[PDB]
Enzyme design. Structure first.
Site, PDB file in Angstrom:
ATOM      1  N   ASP A 212       0.201 -43.403  -9.001  1.00  0.00           N
ATOM      2  CA  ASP A 212       1.631 -43.374  -9.274  1.00  0.00           C
ATOM      3  C   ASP A 212       2.299 -42.263  -8.460  1.00  0.00           C
ATOM      4  O   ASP A 212       1.684 -41.640  -7.591  1.00  0.00           O
ATOM      5  CB  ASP A 212       1.883 -43.228 -10.773  1.00  0.00           C
ATOM      6  CG  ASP A 212       1.039 -42.145 -11.402  1.00  0.00           C
ATOM      7  OD1 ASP A 212       0.167 -41.600 -10.702  1.00  0.00           O
ATOM      8  OD2 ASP A 212       1.246 -41.837 -12.593  1.00  0.00           O
TER       9      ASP A 212
HETATM   10  C1  LIG Z   1       7.978 -21.804 -13.668  1.00  0.00           C
HETATM   11  C2  LIG Z   1       8.217 -22.403 -15.052  1.00  0.00           C
HETATM   12  C3  LIG Z   1       9.445 -23.309 -15.096  1.00  0.00           C
HETATM   13  C4  LIG Z   1       9.077 -24.786 -15.211  1.00  0.00           C
HETATM   14  C5  LIG Z   1       9.499 -25.408 -16.540  1.00  0.00           C
HETATM   15  C6  LIG Z   1       9.715 -26.916 -16.428  1.00  0.00           C
HETATM   16  C7  LIG Z   1       9.807 -27.598 -17.792  1.00  0.00           C
HETATM   17  C8  LIG Z   1       9.920 -29.116 -17.681  1.00  0.00           C
HETATM   18  C9  LIG Z   1       8.762 -29.855 -18.347  1.00  0.00           C
HETATM   19  C10 LIG Z   1       9.202 -31.150 -19.028  1.00  0.00           C
HETATM   20  C11 LIG Z   1      10.119 -31.994 -18.147  1.00  0.00           C
HETATM   21  C12 LIG Z   1       9.974 -33.493 -18.409  1.00  0.00           C
HETATM   22  O1  LIG Z   1       8.942 -33.923 -18.794  1.00  0.00           O
HETATM   23  S1  LIG Z   1      11.367 -34.623 -18.128  1.00  0.00           S
HETATM   24  C13 LIG Z   1      10.906 -36.270 -18.742  1.00  0.00           C
HETATM   25  C14 LIG Z   1      11.656 -37.352 -17.972  1.00  0.00           C
HETATM   26  N1  LIG Z   1      11.212 -38.663 -18.407  1.00  0.00           N
HETATM   27  C15 LIG Z   1      11.792 -39.862 -17.829  1.00  0.00           C
HETATM   28  O2  LIG Z   1      12.629 -39.775 -16.998  1.00  0.00           O
HETATM   29  C16 LIG Z   1      11.315 -41.235 -18.295  1.00  0.00           C
HETATM   30  C17 LIG Z   1      11.432 -42.410 -17.328  1.00  0.00           C
HETATM   31  N2  LIG Z   1      10.306 -42.435 -16.411  1.00  0.00           N
HETATM   32  C18 LIG Z   1      10.517 -42.181 -14.998  1.00  0.00           C
HETATM   33  O3  LIG Z   1      11.613 -41.963 -14.605  1.00  0.00           O
HETATM   34  C19 LIG Z   1       9.334 -42.216 -14.030  1.00  0.00           C
HETATM   35  O4  LIG Z   1       8.254 -42.841 -14.661  1.00  0.00           O
HETATM   36  C20 LIG Z   1       8.900 -40.817 -13.590  1.00  0.00           C
HETATM   37  C21 LIG Z   1       8.672 -39.935 -14.814  1.00  0.00           C
HETATM   38  C22 LIG Z   1       9.950 -40.185 -12.680  1.00  0.00           C
HETATM   39  C23 LIG Z   1       7.601 -40.942 -12.802  1.00  0.00           C
HETATM   40  O5  LIG Z   1       7.912 -41.523 -11.567  1.00  0.00           O
HETATM   41  P1  LIG Z   1       6.867 -42.615 -10.916  1.00  0.00           P
HETATM   42  O6  LIG Z   1       5.871 -43.041 -11.966  1.00  0.00           O
HETATM   43  O7  LIG Z   1       7.643 -43.816 -10.436  1.00  0.00           O
HETATM   44  O8  LIG Z   1       6.135 -41.995  -9.751  1.00  0.00           O
END
Ligand SMILES: CCCCCCCCCCCC(=O)SCCNC(=O)CCNC(=O)[C@H](O)C(C)(C)COP(=O)(O)O
Ligand SMILES: CCCCCCCCCCCCCCCCCC(=O)OC[C@H](COP(=O)([O-])OCC(O)COP(=O)([O-])OC[C@@H](COC(=O)CCCCCCCCCCCCCCCCC)OC(=O)CCCCCCCCCCCCCCCCC)OC(=O)CCCCCCCCCCCCCCCCC
Ligand SMILES: CCCCCCCCCCCCCCCCCC(=O)OC[C@H](COP(=O)([O-])OCC(O)COP(=O)([O-])OC[C@@H](COC(=O)CCCCCCCCCCCCCCCCC)OC(=O)CCCCCCCCCCCCCCCCC)OC(=O)CCCCCCCCCCCCCCCCC
Ligand SMILES: CCCCCCCCCCCCCCCCC[C@@H](O)O[C@H](CO[C@H](O)CCCCCCCCCCCCCCC)COP(=O)(O)OCC[N+](C)(C)C
Ligand SMILES: CCCCCCCCCCCCCCCCC[C@@H](O)O[C@H](CO[C@H](O)CCCCCCCCCCCCCCC)COP(=O)(O)OCC[N+](C)(C)C
Ligand SMILES: N[C@@H](Cc1ccc(O)cc1)C(=O)O
Lengths: 178, 88, 69, 104, 56, 458
Positions: free
Chosen positions: B43
Site C-alpha cells: 500500500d
Molecule cells: C515528532 C512528533 C509529532 C508527530 C505526531 C503525529 C500524530 C499523528 C498520528 C495520527 C494521525 C492519523 O492517524 S490521521 C488518520 C486519517 N485517516 C483517514 O484519512 C482514513 C481514510 N483512509 C485514507 O485516506 C488512506 O487509506 C490513507 C490512510 C491515506 C492511506 O493511503 P493509501 O492506503 O492509499 O496508501
C-alpha cells in the site's frame, strides 16, 4: 522538482506527506537506530489504526488534530540532507554553473583547443535548429483553445520528432560542474 | 580522491539490495520491473517507507511530488540516475 | 574520465591584464633604473652654511637631485 | 491603417566581436580600433600615470616643511641653552600694543 | 608623398602650439607686474656685479 | 595659467578639423596631454597662493580640482564613444564640443580671482550640461530632468548675484585677496541674515543640501554616461569650493546661521543612506550615495575648522573619483541589458570576473575602507564634528553602518547569487571598459600614497 504540480493536494497525499514528515522528525528525536525503529513501528500502527474510516469529515478532523500535534511536538532542529533546501551544501556549487551559450563567445584561439567537442556542439545546435518549428507546431496542435490548464508537456509522437521544449532541460550544466 | 563515479549498474544493485532487506517483499519474487502495488501487493505507506529507505541509502532527499510517482525499482533507478547525472 | 568544463571566455581579461602590465612596465622599468642610477652615482646634497657674499640659486635650496632639477 | 505613423523598426544591437573576434571595443574599424587602444594605453598609463606620479613624488619642498623643522630646531636649542621658556603665550610684543586708556 | 600625411595629421600641432602660446602669454603677463621687483622688505637685495634684474 | 586654457580652446578646432574616423583618438590623446600639463599646478606654497595674474590664481584647494577635471575629460571621452557609434559625424563633434566647453568653463571657474567672474563661469557651466542631458539622454524623462536641473540652480544663484554686486558697492572690491585681507565682522541684523542666506543658498542647492536635492536623482539618472560622470565628480564640488571661498566674509554670523543646515545635513545624510537600502534603479542608488557624502561635506564646511576643511577637500576628491567609477560600472551592465533595474541581471561574477573585481574595489572605496582617502576625509570630518559636539558621533556612527550595508547590498545583488537564465547576450568585457575602470581606480590608491596633495590649504 521534475513533475508538474496539480491544482490541489488530495486527502491521501496530505496524509502521506504528514506521515513522512512525522517519521523524519521522530528520527531526528530518536537518534539511535533501534529506538527509531521501535517508535516508527508505533507511529505506523497509530497511523493505520484509523485507515478504514468511511466518514471523510472525521478523517479530515483526525488529520487536523494530527497536524496540530506535529506542530507542537516538532524538532526545532531536524536533520536536513546536506543538499536539501535547508542543508549545509544546498546551493554550494551554483557559482560553478555556467550556461552553455557562453561557449559561443570564446575567442577562436580558445576554440582551437577542443576541436571535436565544438564539432559535436555544432551538431547539437543543428539538431535544435531543425527541431524547433516542429516542436512549436506540435504544441500549437495539442493545446486546448482556452490555453493550457497544467504545466505538463507532451512527448514526441512522430517519426523523428523531439519532445517540445527540450533544449534547456537536456543541456543542464551539471550537478558538479567544475 | 572523492567518491567513485556511480554507475547505473551500481545504482540498480543498491536499490535491489535495499528492497531484498525489506521483510514485506519476497526476494525471489522481486524483479526490477515489479510493481509495488500490483505485483508485490503493498500500500501507500509501504511505498513511503521504501522511498525513505532509498533516501537513507543514497544520502539525498526525493521530493514528495516526485516520490509519489515511483512504483517499481526501475523508476527509482532512473530517477536517481537522472538526479546525479549518471549516463553510463 | 576527463570532462569539458564550461567557463566564460577568459581570453579578453587576460589580454587586458597583459597589455596593462606591459605598458606600465615599459615606462616604469626605465624610471626605476634611472632613479637607482641617480641615487647611486649622484647622491643627495649636503647641508652647508652660505659663504659670505654668495647668493645661491633657488634650486640650491633643495637636497634631492631630481627635486633640484 | 490601424497605425499611427510611418516609422523605422527598432534595430537590434551590433556585436563588435562578430566581425572582429579580438575587437578591443573601441571602433568597428579594426585598425582604428587597435590604434585607439594603443594610444589610450600609452598616453594614459605610460605617460600620465607613471611619469606624473614620479614627477609629483619628487616635487621640491615649496611647502617649507624641512625649513620649518630646521628653524624650530635652532629656536629650541637657543631657548633651552639660555633657559628661556620654549614658547610664549603672546606672539606679539606688548610694547607695540596700546590698550584703551580706561576699562571702567 | 608627405602631402597626404600632412593633410591628414596637421591637426596634431594645434594643442602643442596652444601650449607654447599660453606659456608666452604668461611670460608677457608676468612682464606687467614688476612694480615691486627687488623692492619688498623681505627680499630686497643688492644687485650682483653683472645681473640687471632679480627675476624676469 | 593660459598654458592650460589655450590648449583646450585648441582642442575645439582640432576636433572640428579632424577626419571623421579620428575624432576620438585625437581628443583622447590631447586631453591626456593637457592633464599631464595641469599636473604641474600641484607645486604649492605654504603661505600664499600662486597669483598668476590679475585674473587667475591657483590655491592648494583648487589645484586638485583642476587636475580632477582635466583627468575626467579623457575618461568621459572613452566612456561615450560606445553608445555614440551610430551618431552622425557632425553630432559627435558637437557632443565633444560640449564636453570641451564644459572643461574650459570649469577650469576658468576654479581659478578666477574675482567673485563676479567666478559667478559668470559657474553659471556658464549650466548650458553645456543642460544641452548634453536634454539632447543625448535616452528616455522621455530627460526633458523634465533638464528643467529640474536648471531652475533649482538659478533660483539659488539669482539672489547671490544681487548680494555680490551689493557687496561691491559696500567694500569696493570683489577680488578674493582683497576680500580676505580687508575682512570685517558681520553684525546681527535682519539685513545681515538675508545677506548670509543670499551668499549661501546657491552653493547649498549645488551640493545639494538635503531637502533641496530632488533635481539630482532626476538629472543624474536621465543623463548620458559622460553627463553623469561630470555631474557627480566635478559639478557637485562647485558648491563646496564656493562655500569655502565665501565663508571668509560671513563671520561671526555663521556661528548660529549654520544650525538649520547642520541639522538638515546630518539627518538627511541618515535619510538618504536609508533610501539607498530600498532602491530598484541602480543609478538612483549611486545618486543618493552622492547626496549622503555631500551632506558630510556640508557639515565639514559649516563647522569651520582646519581639520574639517582638510576633510572636506579630501572627501570631495575621493567622492568624485569613486562616484564616477560607480556610474561607469553601472553603465556597462546597462549597455549589455538595456535596463537599469538592479535585480534584472544577477550573478554577474560568474560571467564577468574582472568586472566583478572592479565592482568590489569601487564598493570598498565607497564604504571608506582604510587607508583610502575616502576614509581619511570621513575620519577628519567626524573628528572635527566630535570636537564641535560629542553627540554627533551618534549620527555619524549610524551613517557609517548604513553606507557599508547598502554598498555591499549593491554588490551582492549584481555579482553574487545565480545568473538570470533568459539573459543570453552578456558578452565578455572589452579592453576599453577595463581600461576605464583601471584609470579610475589607480589614481585613488596613488593619492593614498601621498595624501597631502588633496588636503587643501589648511
Ligand atoms: C515528532 C512528533 C509529532 C508527530 C505526531 C503525529 C500524530 C499523528 C498520528 C495520527 C494521525 C492519523 O492517524 S490521521 C488518520 C486519517 N485517516 C483517514 O484519512 C482514513 C481514510 N483512509 C485514507 O485516506 C488512506 O487509506 C490513507 C490512510 C491515506 C492511506 O493511503 P493509501 O492506503 O492509499 O496508501
Ligand atoms: C606591476 C604592474 C601592474 C599594475 C600595478 C599598478 C602599478 C601603478 C604604478 C604607478 C606609478 C608609481 C610611481 C611612483 C613613484 C615613486 C618613486 C619613489 O619615490 O621611490 C621612493 C623610494 C626611493 O626614495 P629616494 O628619495 O629616491 O632615495 C633617497 C636616497 O637618496 C637613496 O638612498 P641610497 O643612496 O642608499 O640609494 C639607494 C639605491 C641603492 O641602494 C642599494 O643598492 C642598497 C640596497 C641593499 C643592498 C645591501 C646588501 C645587498 C648586496 C650585498 C651583496 C653584494 C656586495 C658584495 C659582493 C660580494 C657578495 C658577497 O636604491 C634606490 O635608489 C631605491 C630604488 C629605486 C626605486 C624607485 C621606484 C620607481 C618605480 C616607478 C615605476 C612604477 C611601476 C613599477 C615598475 C618598477 C620595476 C619593477 O623607492 C622605494 O620604493 C624604496 C623602498 C624600499 C625600502 C625598504 C622597504 C622597507 C619596508 C618597511 C615596511 C614593512 C612592512 C611590510 C611591507 C613591506 C612591503 C614592501
Ligand atoms: C596588503 C598586502 C601588500 C602586498 C604588497 C604588494 C601589493 C601590490 C598591490 C598593488 C595595487 C593593487 C592593484 C589594484 C587593482 C586590482 C588588480 C586587478 O585588477 O586584478 C587583476 C589581477 C589578475 O588576477 P586574476 O587571476 O586575473 O583574477 C582576477 C579576478 O577578477 C579575481 O581576482 P581576486 O579574487 O584575486 O581579487 C583581486 C584583488 C584585488 O582587488 C583589490 O581589492 C586591490 C585594491 C585594493 C583595495 C582598494 C580599496 C581599499 C582602500 C585601501 C587603499 C590601499 C592602497 C595603498 C597604496 C597603493 C599604491 C598604488 O582583491 C582581493 O584579492 C581581496 C581584496 C581585499 C583587500 C583587503 C586589504 C585592505 C587593506 C589592508 C592593507 C592596505 C595598506 C597596506 C599598508 C598598511 C600598513 C602597513 O589580480 C591579482 O593579481 C591579485 C591582486 C592582488 C591583491 C592586492 C591586495 C593587497 C594590496 C592592497 C594595496 C597595496 C598596498 C601596497 C603597499 C605595500 C604594503
Ligand atoms: C596587477 C598586479 C597588481 C599587484 C602586483 C604589484 C607589484 C608591486 C607594485 C606595487 C608597489 C607597492 C607600493 C608601495 C609604496 C612604494 C613607493 C612610495 O615609497 O613612494 C611614495 C611616492 O608616491 C607618490 O608621491 C604618490 C603618487 C602621486 C599621485 C598622482 C597620480 C597621477 C595623476 C593621475 C590623474 C589624477 C586624478 C586625481 C586628481 C586629484 C612615497 O612618497 P614620499 O614619502 O614623499 O618619498 C620621500 C622621498 N622623496 C620625496 C624624495 C621622493
Ligand atoms: C527645504 C530646505 C530649504 C533650505 C533650508 C534653509 C534654512 C533657513 C532657516 C533660517 C535660519 C534662521 C533665520 C534667522 C535667524 C533667527 C530666526 C528667529 O526664529 O530667531 C529669533 C527671531 O525672533 C522671532 O522668531 C522673530 C522671527 C519670526 C518671523 C520669521 C518667520 C519664520 C516662520 C517659519 C516660515 C518658514 C521659512 C522657510 C520657508 C521654506 C531670534 O530672536 P531675535 O534676537 O529677536 O532675532 C535675531 C535677529 N535680530 C538680532 C536682528 C533681532
Ligand atoms: N592644510 C594643511 C595641509 C597639509 C596636510 C598634511 C601635510 O603633511 C602637509 C600639509 C597644511 O598644514
Amino acid at each position: 522538482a521534475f513533475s508538474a504540480p496539480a491544482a490541489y493536494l488530495t486527502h491521501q497525499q496530505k496524509v502521506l506527506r504528514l506521515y513522512k514528515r512525522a517519521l523524519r522528525h521522530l528520527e531526528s528525536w530518536c537518534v539511535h537506530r533501534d529506538k527509531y525503529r521501535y517508535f516508527a513501528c508505533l507511529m505506523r500502527a497509530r497511523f493505520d489504526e484509523h485507515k478504514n474510516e468511511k466518514d471523510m469529515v472525521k478523517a479530515t478532523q483526525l488529520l487536523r488534530q494530527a497536524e496540530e500535534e506535529f506542530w507542537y511536538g516538532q524538532h526545532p532542529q531536524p536533520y536536513i540532507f546536506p543538499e536539501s533546501p535547508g542543508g549545509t551544501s544546498y546551493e554550494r556549487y551554483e557559482c560553478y554553473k555556467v550556461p552553455e551559450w557562453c561557449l559561443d563567445d570564446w575567442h577562436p584561439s580558445e576554440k582551437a583547443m577542443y576541436p571535436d567537442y565544438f564539432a559535436k556542439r555544432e551538431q547539437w545546435k543543428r539538431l535544435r535548429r531543425e527541431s524547433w518549428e516542429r516542436e512549436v507546431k506540435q504544441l500549437q496542435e495539442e493545446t486546448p483553445p482556452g490555453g493550457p490548464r497544467t504545466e505538463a508537456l507532451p512527448p514526441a509522437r512522430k517519426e523523428g520528432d523531439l519532445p517540445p521544449l527540450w533544449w534547456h532541460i537536456v543541456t543542464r550544466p551539471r550537478e558538479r560542474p567544475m | 580522491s572523492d567518491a567513485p563515479p556511480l554507475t547505473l549498474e551500481a545504482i540498480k544493485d543498491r536499490v535491489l539490495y535495499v528492497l531484498k532487506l525489506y521483510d514485506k517483499i519476497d526476494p525471489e519474487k522481486l524483479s526490477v520491473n515489479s510493481h509495488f502495488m500490483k505485483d508485490l501487493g503493498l500500500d501507500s505507506l509501504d511505498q513511503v517507507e521504501i522511498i525513505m529507505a532509498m533516501e537513507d541509502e543514497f544520502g539525498f532527499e526525493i521530493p514528495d511530488i516526485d516520490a509519489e510517482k515511483l512504483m517499481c525499482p526501475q523508476e527509482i533507478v532512473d530517477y536517481i540516475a537522472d538526479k546525479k547525472d549518471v549516463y553510463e | 574520465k576527463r570532462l569539458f568544463i564550461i567557463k566564460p571566455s577568459g581570453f579578453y581579461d587576460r589580454r587586458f591584464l597583459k597589455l596593462m602590465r606591459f605598458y606600465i612596465l615599459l615606462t616604469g622599468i626605465p624610471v626605476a633604473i634611472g632613479i637607482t642610477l641617480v641615487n647611486v652615482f649622484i647622491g643627495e646634497a649636503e647641508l652647508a652654511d652660505i659663504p659670505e657674499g654668495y647668493v645661491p640659486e633657488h634650486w640650491e635650496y633643495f637636497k634631492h637631485p631630481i627635486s633640484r632639477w | 491603417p490601424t497605425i499611427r505613423l510611418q516609422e523605422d523598426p527598432d534595430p537590434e544591437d551590433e556585436n563588435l566581436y562578430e566581425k572582429n573576434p579580438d575587437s578591443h571595443g573601441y571602433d568597428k574599424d579594426p585598425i582604428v580600433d587597435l590604434w585607439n587602444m594603443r594610444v589610450v594605453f600609452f598616453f594614459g598609463f605610460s605617460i600620465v600615470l607613471v611619469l606624473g606620479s614620479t614627477f609629483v613624488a619628487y616635487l621640491p619642498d615649496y611647502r617649507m616643511q624641512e625649513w620649518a623643522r630646521r628653524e624650530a630646531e635652532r629656536l629650541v636649542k637657543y631657548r633651552e641653552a639660555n633657559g628661556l621658556p620654549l614658547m610664549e603665550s603672546n606672539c606679539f610684543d606688548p610694547n607695540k600694543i596700546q590698550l584703551p586708556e580706561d576699562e571702567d | 608623398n608627405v602631402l597626404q600625411i600632412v593633410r591628414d595629421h596637421w591637426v596634431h600641432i594645434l594643442v602643442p602650439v596652444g601650449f607654447v602660446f599660453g606659456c608666452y602669454l604668461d611670460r608677457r603677463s608676468d612682464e606687467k607686474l614688476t612694480a615691486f621687483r627687488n623692492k619688498s622688505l623681505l627680499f630686497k637685495r643688492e644687485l650682483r656685479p653683472n645681473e640687471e634684474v632679480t627675476w624676469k | 595659467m593660459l598654458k592650460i586654457i589655450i590648449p583646450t580652446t585648441m582642442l575645439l578646432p582640432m576636433t572640428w578639423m579632424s577626419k571623421h574616423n579620428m575624432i576620438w583618438i585625437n581628443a583622447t590623446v590631447h586631453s591626456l596631454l593637457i592633464s599631464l600639463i595641469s599636473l604641474s599646478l600641484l607645486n604649492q606654497l605654504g603661505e600664499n597662493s600662486l597669483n598668476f595674474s590679475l585674473t587667475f590664481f591657483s590655491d592648494s584647494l583648487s589645484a586638485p580640482l583642476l587636475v580632477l577635471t582635466t583627468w575626467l575629460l579623457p575618461l568621459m571621452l572613452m566612456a561615450s564613444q560606445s553608445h555614440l557609434s551610430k551618431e552622425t559625424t557632425t553630432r559627435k563633434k558637437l557632443y565633444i564640443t560640449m564636453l570641451i566647453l564644459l572643461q574650459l568653463f570649469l577650469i576658468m571657474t576654479f581659478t578666477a580671482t574675482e567673485l563676479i567672474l567666478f559667478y559668470i563661469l559657474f553659471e556658464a557651466t549650466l548650458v553645456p550640461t543642460l544641452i548634453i542631458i536634454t539632447r543625448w539622454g535616452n528616455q522621455t524623462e530627460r526633458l523634465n530632468a533638464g528643467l529640474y536641473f536648471l531652475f533649482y540652480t538659478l533660483a539659488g544663484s539669482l539672489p547671490l548675484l544681487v548680494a555680490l554686486v551689493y557687496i561691491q558697492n559696500t567694500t569696493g572690491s570683489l577680488n578674493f585677496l582683497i576680500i580676505h585681507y580687508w575682512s570685517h565682522p558681520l553684525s546681527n541684523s535682519w539685513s545681515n541674515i538675508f545677506m548670509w542666506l543670499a551668499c549661501i543658498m546657491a552653493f547649498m542647492v549645488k551640493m545639494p543640501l538635503y531637502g533641496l536635492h530632488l533635481w539630482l536623482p532626476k538629472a543624474h539618472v536621465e543623463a548620458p554616461i559622460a553627463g553623469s560622470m561630470v555631474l557627480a565628480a566635478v559639478l557637485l564640488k562647485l558648491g563646496g569650493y564656493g562655500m569655502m571661498r565665501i565663508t571668509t566674509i560671513l563671520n561671526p554670523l555663521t556661528n548660529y546661521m549654520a544650525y538649520p543646515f547642520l541639522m538638515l545635513s546630518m539627518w538627511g545624510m541618515i535619510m538618504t543612506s536609508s533610501i539607498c537600502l530600498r532602491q530598484t534603479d541602480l543609478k538612483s542608488l549611486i545618486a543618493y550615495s552622492s547626496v549622503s557624502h555631500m551632506a558630510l561635506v556640508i557639515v565639514a564646511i559649516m563647522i569651520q575648522t582646519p581639520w574639517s576643511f582638510m576633510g572636506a577637500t579630501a572627501l570631495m576628491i575621493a567622492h568624485g573619483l569613486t562616484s564616477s567609477m560607480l556610474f561607469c560600472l553601472a553603465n556597462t551592465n546597462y549597455e549589455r541589458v538595456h535596463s537599469r533595474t538592479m535585480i534584472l541581471a544577477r550573478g554577474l561574477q560568474t560571467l564577468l570576473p574582472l568586472m566583478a573585481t572592479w565592482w568590489l574595489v569601487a564598493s570598498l572605496t565607497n564604504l571608506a575602507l582604510p587607508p583610502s582617502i575616502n576614509l581619511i576625509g570621513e575620519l577628519f570630518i567626524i573628528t572635527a564634528s566630535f570636537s564641535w559636539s560629542n553627540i554627533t558621533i551618534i549620527l555619524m556612527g549610524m551613517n557609517m553602518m548604513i553606507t557599508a550595508l547598502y554598498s555591499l547590498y549593491m554588490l551582492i545583488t549584481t555579482q553574487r547569487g545565480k545568473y538570470t537564465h533568459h539573459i543570453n547576450n552578456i558578452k565578455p568585457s572589452f579592453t576599453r571598459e577595463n581600461a576605464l575602470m583601471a584609470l579610475h581606480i589607480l589614481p585613488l590608491l596613488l593619492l593614498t600614497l601621498n595624501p597631502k596633495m588633496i588636503l587643501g590649504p589648511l
